[PDB]
CSV table of all heavy atoms in Angstrom, one decimal:
chain,number,residue,atom,x,y,z
A,168,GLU,N,14.5,14.0,-3.4
A,168,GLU,CA,15.7,13.2,-3.5
A,168,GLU,C,15.7,11.9,-2.7
A,168,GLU,O,16.1,10.8,-3.2
A,168,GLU,CB,17.0,14.1,-3.3
A,168,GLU,CG,17.7,14.2,-2.0
A,168,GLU,CD,18.7,15.3,-1.9
A,168,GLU,OE1,18.5,16.5,-2.1
A,168,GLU,OE2,20.0,14.9,-1.5
A,169,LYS,N,15.2,11.9,-1.5
A,169,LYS,CA,15.0,10.8,-0.6
A,169,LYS,C,13.8,9.8,-0.9
A,169,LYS,O,13.8,8.6,-0.6
A,169,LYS,CB,15.0,11.4,0.8
A,169,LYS,CG,15.2,10.6,2.1
A,169,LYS,CD,15.5,11.5,3.3
A,169,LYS,CE,15.6,10.8,4.7
A,169,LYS,NZ,14.2,10.4,5.1
A,170,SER,N,12.8,10.4,-1.6
A,170,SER,CA,11.7,9.6,-2.3
A,170,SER,C,12.2,8.5,-3.3
A,170,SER,O,11.7,7.4,-3.4
A,170,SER,CB,10.9,10.7,-3.1
A,170,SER,OG,9.5,10.7,-2.8
A,171,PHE,N,13.3,8.9,-4.0
A,171,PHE,CA,14.1,8.0,-5.0
A,171,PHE,C,14.8,6.9,-4.2
A,171,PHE,O,14.7,5.7,-4.6
A,171,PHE,CB,15.0,9.0,-5.7
A,171,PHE,CG,15.7,8.3,-7.0
A,171,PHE,CD1,15.2,8.5,-8.3
A,171,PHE,CD2,16.8,7.5,-6.8
A,171,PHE,CE1,15.8,8.0,-9.4
A,171,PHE,CE2,17.5,7.0,-7.9
A,171,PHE,CZ,17.0,7.3,-9.2
A,172,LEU,N,15.6,7.3,-3.2
A,172,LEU,CA,16.4,6.3,-2.3
A,172,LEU,C,15.5,5.2,-1.6
A,172,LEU,O,16.1,4.2,-1.2
A,172,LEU,CB,17.2,7.1,-1.3
A,172,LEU,CG,18.2,8.2,-2.0
A,172,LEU,CD1,18.9,8.9,-0.9
A,172,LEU,CD2,19.2,7.5,-2.9
A,173,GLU,N,14.2,5.4,-1.5
A,173,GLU,CA,13.2,4.3,-1.0
A,173,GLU,C,12.9,3.4,-2.2
A,173,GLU,O,13.2,2.2,-2.2
A,173,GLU,CB,12.0,5.1,-0.4
A,173,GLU,CG,11.1,4.2,0.5
A,173,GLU,CD,10.0,3.4,-0.3
A,173,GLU,OE1,9.0,3.9,-0.7
A,173,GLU,OE2,10.4,2.1,-0.5
A,174,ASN,N,12.3,4.0,-3.3
A,174,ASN,CA,12.0,3.3,-4.6
A,174,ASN,C,12.4,4.3,-5.7
A,174,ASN,O,11.9,5.5,-5.8
A,174,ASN,CB,10.6,2.7,-4.7
A,174,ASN,CG,9.3,3.4,-4.1
A,174,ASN,OD1,9.3,4.6,-3.9
A,174,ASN,ND2,8.3,2.6,-3.9
A,175,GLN,N,13.2,3.8,-6.6
A,175,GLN,CA,13.9,4.6,-7.7
A,175,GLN,C,13.0,5.0,-8.9
A,175,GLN,O,12.9,6.2,-9.2
A,175,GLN,CB,15.2,3.9,-8.2
A,175,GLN,CG,16.3,3.7,-7.1
A,175,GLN,CD,17.6,3.1,-7.7
A,175,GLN,OE1,18.4,3.8,-8.2
A,175,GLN,NE2,17.8,1.8,-7.6
A,176,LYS,N,12.3,4.0,-9.5
A,176,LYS,CA,11.2,4.2,-10.5
A,176,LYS,C,9.9,3.8,-10.0
A,176,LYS,O,9.4,2.7,-10.4
A,176,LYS,CB,11.7,3.5,-11.8
A,176,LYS,CG,10.9,3.8,-13.1
A,176,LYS,CD,11.5,3.2,-14.4
A,176,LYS,CE,10.6,3.5,-15.6
A,176,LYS,NZ,11.2,2.9,-16.8
A,177,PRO,N,9.2,4.5,-9.1
A,177,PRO,CA,7.8,4.2,-8.6
A,177,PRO,C,6.6,5.0,-9.4
A,177,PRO,O,5.6,5.2,-8.8
A,177,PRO,CB,8.0,4.8,-7.2
A,177,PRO,CG,8.6,6.2,-7.5
A,177,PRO,CD,9.7,5.8,-8.5
A,178,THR,N,6.9,5.3,-10.6
A,178,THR,CA,6.6,6.6,-11.2
A,178,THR,C,5.1,7.1,-11.2
A,178,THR,O,4.8,7.7,-10.1
A,178,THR,CB,7.3,6.7,-12.6
A,178,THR,OG1,8.7,6.2,-12.5
A,178,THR,CG2,7.4,8.0,-13.3
A,179,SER,N,4.3,7.0,-12.2
A,179,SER,CA,2.9,7.6,-12.3
A,179,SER,C,2.0,7.6,-11.0
A,179,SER,O,1.3,8.5,-10.7
A,179,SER,CB,2.2,7.0,-13.5
A,179,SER,OG,2.7,7.6,-14.7
A,180,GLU,N,2.1,6.5,-10.2
A,180,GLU,CA,1.3,6.3,-9.0
A,180,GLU,C,1.9,7.1,-7.8
A,180,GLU,O,1.2,7.8,-7.0
A,180,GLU,CB,1.0,4.8,-8.6
A,180,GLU,CG,-0.1,4.1,-9.5
A,180,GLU,CD,0.4,3.7,-10.9
A,180,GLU,OE1,1.1,2.8,-11.2
A,180,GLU,OE2,-0.2,4.6,-11.8
A,181,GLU,N,3.2,7.0,-7.6
A,181,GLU,CA,4.0,7.7,-6.5
A,181,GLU,C,4.1,9.2,-6.6
A,181,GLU,O,4.0,9.9,-5.6
A,181,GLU,CB,5.4,7.0,-6.4
A,181,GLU,CG,6.1,7.1,-5.0
A,181,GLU,CD,5.5,6.3,-3.9
A,181,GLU,OE1,6.0,5.0,-4.0
A,181,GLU,OE2,4.7,6.7,-3.1
A,182,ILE,N,4.3,9.8,-7.9
A,182,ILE,CA,4.3,11.2,-8.1
A,182,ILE,C,3.1,12.0,-7.5
A,182,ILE,O,3.2,13.0,-6.8
A,182,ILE,CB,4.4,11.4,-9.7
A,182,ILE,CG1,5.9,11.4,-10.1
A,182,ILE,CG2,3.8,12.7,-10.4
A,182,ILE,CD1,6.4,10.1,-10.6
A,183,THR,N,1.9,11.4,-7.6
A,183,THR,CA,0.6,11.8,-6.9
A,183,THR,C,0.7,11.8,-5.4
A,183,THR,O,0.5,12.8,-4.7
A,183,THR,CB,-0.5,10.9,-7.5
A,183,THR,OG1,-0.8,11.3,-8.8
A,183,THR,CG2,-1.9,10.9,-6.7
A,184,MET,N,1.1,10.6,-4.8
A,184,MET,CA,1.2,10.5,-3.3
A,184,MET,C,2.3,11.4,-2.6
A,184,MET,O,2.1,11.9,-1.5
A,184,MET,CB,1.5,9.0,-3.1
A,184,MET,CG,0.3,8.0,-3.3
A,184,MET,SD,-1.1,8.4,-2.2
A,184,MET,CE,-0.5,7.8,-0.6
A,185,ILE,N,3.4,11.6,-3.3
A,185,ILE,CA,4.5,12.6,-2.9
A,185,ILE,C,4.1,14.1,-2.9
A,185,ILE,O,4.3,14.8,-2.0
A,185,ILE,CB,5.8,12.4,-3.8
A,185,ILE,CG1,6.3,10.9,-3.8
A,185,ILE,CG2,7.0,13.3,-3.5
A,185,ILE,CD1,7.3,10.6,-4.9
A,186,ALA,N,3.4,14.5,-4.0
A,186,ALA,CA,2.8,15.9,-4.0
A,186,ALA,C,1.7,16.2,-2.9
A,186,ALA,O,1.7,17.3,-2.4
A,186,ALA,CB,2.2,16.1,-5.4
A,187,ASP,N,0.9,15.2,-2.6
A,187,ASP,CA,-0.1,15.3,-1.5
A,187,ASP,C,0.6,15.5,-0.1
A,187,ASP,O,0.0,16.3,0.7
A,187,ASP,CB,-1.0,14.0,-1.5
A,187,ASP,CG,-2.4,14.2,-0.9
A,187,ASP,OD1,-3.3,14.6,-1.5
A,187,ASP,OD2,-2.4,14.0,0.5
A,188,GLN,N,1.7,14.8,0.2
A,188,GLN,CA,2.5,15.0,1.5
A,188,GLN,C,2.9,16.5,1.8
A,188,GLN,O,2.7,16.9,2.9
A,188,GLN,CB,3.7,14.0,1.4
A,188,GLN,CG,4.5,13.8,2.7
A,188,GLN,CD,3.8,13.2,3.9
A,188,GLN,OE1,3.1,13.9,4.7
A,188,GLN,NE2,3.8,11.9,4.0
A,189,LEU,N,3.4,17.2,0.8
A,189,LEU,CA,3.7,18.7,1.0
A,189,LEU,C,2.6,19.4,0.2
A,189,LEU,O,1.4,19.3,0.4
A,189,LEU,CB,5.2,19.0,0.8
A,189,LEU,CG,6.0,19.1,-0.5
A,189,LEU,CD1,5.7,17.9,-1.5
A,189,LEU,CD2,6.0,20.5,-1.2
A,190,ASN,N,3.0,20.3,-0.7
A,190,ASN,CA,2.1,21.1,-1.7
A,190,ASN,C,3.0,21.3,-2.9
A,190,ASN,O,3.5,22.5,-3.2
A,190,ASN,CB,1.7,22.4,-0.9
A,190,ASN,CG,0.7,23.3,-1.7
A,190,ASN,OD1,0.9,23.7,-2.8
A,190,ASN,ND2,-0.2,23.9,-0.9
A,191,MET,N,3.3,20.3,-3.7
A,191,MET,CA,4.2,20.3,-4.9
A,191,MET,C,3.4,20.4,-6.2
A,191,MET,O,2.3,19.9,-6.3
A,191,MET,CB,5.0,19.0,-4.9
A,191,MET,CG,6.5,19.1,-5.3
A,191,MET,SD,6.8,20.2,-6.7
A,191,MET,CE,8.1,21.2,-5.8
A,192,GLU,N,4.1,20.9,-7.3
A,192,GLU,CA,3.6,20.6,-8.7
A,192,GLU,C,4.1,19.2,-9.1
A,192,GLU,O,5.1,18.7,-8.7
A,192,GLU,CB,3.9,21.7,-9.7
A,192,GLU,CG,3.5,21.6,-11.2
A,192,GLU,CD,2.0,21.5,-11.5
A,192,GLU,OE1,1.1,21.5,-10.7
A,192,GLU,OE2,1.8,21.3,-12.8
A,193,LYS,N,3.2,18.6,-10.0
A,193,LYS,CA,3.5,17.3,-10.6
A,193,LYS,C,4.3,17.1,-11.9
A,193,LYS,O,4.9,16.1,-12.2
A,193,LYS,CB,2.3,16.4,-10.4
A,193,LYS,CG,2.3,15.7,-9.0
A,193,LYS,CD,0.9,15.4,-8.6
A,193,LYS,CE,0.0,14.5,-9.5
A,193,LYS,NZ,-1.3,14.4,-8.9
A,194,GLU,N,4.2,18.2,-12.7
A,194,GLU,CA,5.1,18.4,-13.9
A,194,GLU,C,6.6,18.4,-13.3
A,194,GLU,O,7.4,17.7,-13.8
A,194,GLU,CB,4.7,19.8,-14.5
A,194,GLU,CG,5.4,20.1,-15.9
A,194,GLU,CD,6.9,20.6,-15.8
A,194,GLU,OE1,7.2,21.7,-15.3
A,194,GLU,OE2,7.7,19.6,-16.3
A,195,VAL,N,6.8,19.2,-12.2
A,195,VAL,CA,8.0,19.2,-11.3
A,195,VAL,C,8.5,17.8,-10.9
A,195,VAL,O,9.6,17.5,-11.1
A,195,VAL,CB,7.7,20.1,-10.1
A,195,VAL,CG1,8.8,20.1,-9.0
A,195,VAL,CG2,7.5,21.6,-10.5
A,196,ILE,N,7.6,17.0,-10.2
A,196,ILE,CA,8.1,15.6,-9.6
A,196,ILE,C,8.6,14.7,-10.7
A,196,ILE,O,9.7,14.1,-10.6
A,196,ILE,CB,7.1,14.7,-8.8
A,196,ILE,CG1,5.9,15.2,-8.0
A,196,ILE,CG2,8.0,13.9,-7.8
A,196,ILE,CD1,6.1,16.2,-6.9
A,197,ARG,N,7.9,14.5,-11.8
A,197,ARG,CA,8.2,13.7,-13.0
A,197,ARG,C,9.6,14.1,-13.7
A,197,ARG,O,10.4,13.3,-14.0
A,197,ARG,CB,7.1,13.7,-14.1
A,197,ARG,CG,5.8,13.0,-13.6
A,197,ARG,CD,4.6,13.1,-14.7
A,197,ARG,NE,4.1,14.5,-14.8
A,197,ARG,CZ,2.9,14.8,-15.3
A,197,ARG,NH1,2.1,13.9,-15.9
A,197,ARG,NH2,2.5,16.0,-15.3
A,198,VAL,N,9.7,15.5,-13.9
A,198,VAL,CA,11.0,16.1,-14.4
A,198,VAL,C,12.2,16.0,-13.4
A,198,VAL,O,13.3,15.5,-13.8
A,198,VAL,CB,10.6,17.5,-15.0
A,198,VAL,CG1,11.5,18.7,-14.5
A,198,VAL,CG2,10.4,17.5,-16.5
A,199,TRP,N,12.0,16.4,-12.1
A,199,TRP,CA,13.1,16.1,-11.1
A,199,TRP,C,13.5,14.6,-10.9
A,199,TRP,O,14.7,14.4,-10.9
A,199,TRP,CB,12.6,16.7,-9.7
A,199,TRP,CG,13.7,16.9,-8.7
A,199,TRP,CD1,14.6,17.9,-8.6
A,199,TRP,CD2,14.2,15.9,-7.8
A,199,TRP,NE1,15.8,17.6,-7.8
A,199,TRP,CE2,15.5,16.3,-7.4
A,199,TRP,CE3,13.8,14.6,-7.6
A,199,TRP,CZ2,16.3,15.4,-6.7
A,199,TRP,CZ3,14.6,13.6,-7.0
A,199,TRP,CH2,16.0,14.0,-6.7
A,200,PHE,N,12.5,13.7,-10.9
A,200,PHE,CA,12.8,12.2,-10.9
A,200,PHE,C,13.5,11.7,-12.2
A,200,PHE,O,14.3,10.8,-12.1
A,200,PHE,CB,11.4,11.5,-10.6
A,200,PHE,CG,10.9,11.2,-9.2
A,200,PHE,CD1,9.6,10.7,-9.0
A,200,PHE,CD2,11.8,11.3,-8.1
A,200,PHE,CE1,9.3,10.2,-7.7
A,200,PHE,CE2,11.4,10.7,-6.8
A,200,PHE,CZ,10.2,10.1,-6.7
A,201,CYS,N,13.2,12.3,-13.4
A,201,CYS,CA,13.9,12.0,-14.7
A,201,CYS,C,15.4,12.3,-14.7
A,201,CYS,O,16.2,11.6,-15.2
A,201,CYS,CB,13.2,12.7,-15.8
A,201,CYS,SG,13.6,11.9,-17.4
A,202,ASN,N,15.8,13.5,-14.0
A,202,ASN,CA,17.2,13.9,-13.9
A,202,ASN,C,17.9,13.1,-12.7
A,202,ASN,O,19.1,12.8,-13.0
A,202,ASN,CB,17.1,15.5,-13.6
A,202,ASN,CG,18.5,16.2,-13.8
A,202,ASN,OD1,19.4,16.1,-12.9
A,202,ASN,ND2,18.7,16.9,-14.9
A,203,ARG,N,17.3,12.9,-11.6
A,203,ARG,CA,17.9,11.9,-10.6
A,203,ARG,C,18.1,10.5,-11.0
A,203,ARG,O,19.0,9.8,-10.5
A,203,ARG,CB,16.8,11.9,-9.4
A,203,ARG,CG,17.3,11.3,-8.1
A,203,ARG,CD,18.6,11.8,-7.5
A,203,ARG,NE,18.8,12.0,-6.1
A,203,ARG,CZ,18.7,11.1,-5.1
A,203,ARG,NH1,18.4,9.8,-5.3
A,203,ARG,NH2,19.0,11.5,-3.9
A,204,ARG,N,17.4,10.0,-12.0
A,204,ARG,CA,17.5,8.7,-12.7
A,204,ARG,C,18.9,8.3,-13.2
A,204,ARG,O,19.4,7.2,-13.0
A,204,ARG,CB,16.4,8.5,-13.8
A,204,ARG,CG,15.9,7.1,-14.2
A,204,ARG,CD,15.2,6.3,-13.1
A,204,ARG,NE,14.0,7.0,-12.4
A,204,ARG,CZ,12.8,7.3,-12.9
A,204,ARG,NH1,12.5,7.0,-14.2
A,204,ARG,NH2,11.9,7.9,-12.2
A,205,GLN,N,19.6,9.2,-14.0
A,205,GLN,CA,21.0,9.1,-14.4
A,205,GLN,C,22.1,9.5,-13.4
A,205,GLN,O,23.3,9.3,-13.7
A,205,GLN,CB,21.2,9.6,-15.9
A,205,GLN,CG,21.4,11.1,-16.1
A,205,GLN,CD,20.2,12.0,-15.9
A,205,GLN,OE1,19.1,11.7,-16.0
A,205,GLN,NE2,20.5,13.3,-15.8
A,206,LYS,N,21.7,10.2,-12.3
A,206,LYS,CA,22.7,10.6,-11.2
A,206,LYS,C,21.9,10.5,-9.9
A,206,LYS,O,21.3,11.4,-9.3
A,206,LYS,CB,23.4,11.9,-11.4
A,206,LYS,CG,22.6,13.2,-11.8
A,206,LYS,CD,23.0,13.8,-13.1
A,206,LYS,CE,24.3,14.6,-12.9
A,206,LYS,NZ,24.7,15.3,-14.2
A,207,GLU,N,22.0,9.2,-9.5
A,207,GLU,CA,21.4,8.6,-8.3
A,207,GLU,C,22.1,9.1,-7.0
A,207,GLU,O,21.5,9.9,-6.2
A,207,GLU,CB,21.3,7.1,-8.4
A,207,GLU,CG,20.5,6.5,-9.6
A,207,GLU,CD,21.4,6.0,-10.7
A,207,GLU,OE1,22.0,6.7,-11.6
A,207,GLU,OE2,21.5,4.6,-10.7
A,208,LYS,N,23.3,8.7,-6.7
A,208,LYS,CA,24.2,9.2,-5.6
A,208,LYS,C,25.6,9.3,-6.2
A,208,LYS,O,26.5,8.5,-6.0
A,208,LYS,CB,24.0,8.2,-4.4
A,208,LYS,CG,24.7,8.8,-3.1
A,208,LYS,CD,24.5,7.8,-1.9
A,208,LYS,CE,25.2,8.3,-0.6
A,208,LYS,NZ,24.9,7.4,0.5
A,209,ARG,N,25.8,10.4,-7.1
A,209,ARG,CA,27.0,10.6,-7.9
A,209,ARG,C,27.7,11.9,-7.4
A,209,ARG,O,28.5,11.9,-6.5
A,209,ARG,CB,26.6,10.5,-9.4
A,209,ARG,CG,27.7,10.5,-10.4
A,209,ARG,CD,27.2,10.4,-11.9
A,209,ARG,NE,28.3,10.5,-12.9
A,209,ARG,CZ,28.1,10.5,-14.2
A,209,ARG,NH1,26.9,10.5,-14.8
A,209,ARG,NH2,29.2,10.6,-15.0
A,210,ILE,N,27.3,13.1,-8.1
A,210,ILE,CA,28.0,14.4,-7.7
A,210,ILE,C,26.8,15.4,-7.5
A,210,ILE,O,26.4,15.6,-6.3
A,210,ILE,CB,29.1,14.8,-8.8
A,210,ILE,CG1,30.2,13.8,-8.9
A,210,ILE,CG2,29.7,16.2,-8.4
A,210,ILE,CD1,31.1,14.0,-10.2
A,211,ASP,N,26.3,15.9,-8.6
A,211,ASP,CA,25.2,17.0,-8.5
A,211,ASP,C,23.8,16.4,-8.5
A,211,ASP,O,23.3,15.8,-9.5
A,211,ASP,CB,25.4,18.0,-9.7
A,211,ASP,CG,26.6,18.9,-9.7
A,211,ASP,OD1,26.5,20.0,-8.9
A,211,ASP,OD2,27.6,18.6,-10.3
C-alpha cells in the first residue's frame, strides 16, 4: 500500500524490487497494485 504512495504506476521494474525487500509473489504485486489504482486513498 505505501509502495503506491511513493510512486503510483512504477510498474514492471518496481514489482521486482518490492518482492526482493520481503519474500513476496509477483503475480500478487501486479494484481494488488491494479486494485489500489482505482482506490488510492478512498475507503477499502
Side-chain angles (χ1 to χ4, degrees):
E168 104 191 53
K169 194 168 172 289
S170 236
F171 192 100
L172 304 176
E173 194 279 280
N174 35 28
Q175 302 183 81
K176 187 176 181 180
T178 316
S179 284
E180 286 74 78
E181 204 74 82
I182 274 97
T183 289
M184 289 302 281
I185 302 161
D187 207 90
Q188 190 65 270
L189 77 313
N190 182 316
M191 219 318 127
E192 180 59 3
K193 278 150 57 184
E194 192 284 290
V195 171
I196 342 296
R197 292 178 289 195
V198 133
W199 195 78
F200 273 173
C201 203
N202 194 286
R203 192 54 140 59
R204 206 66 50 72
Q205 82 287 340
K206 47 237 288 182
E207 299 107 280
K208 189 178 180 180
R209 188 184 179 183
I210 304 165
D211 292 278

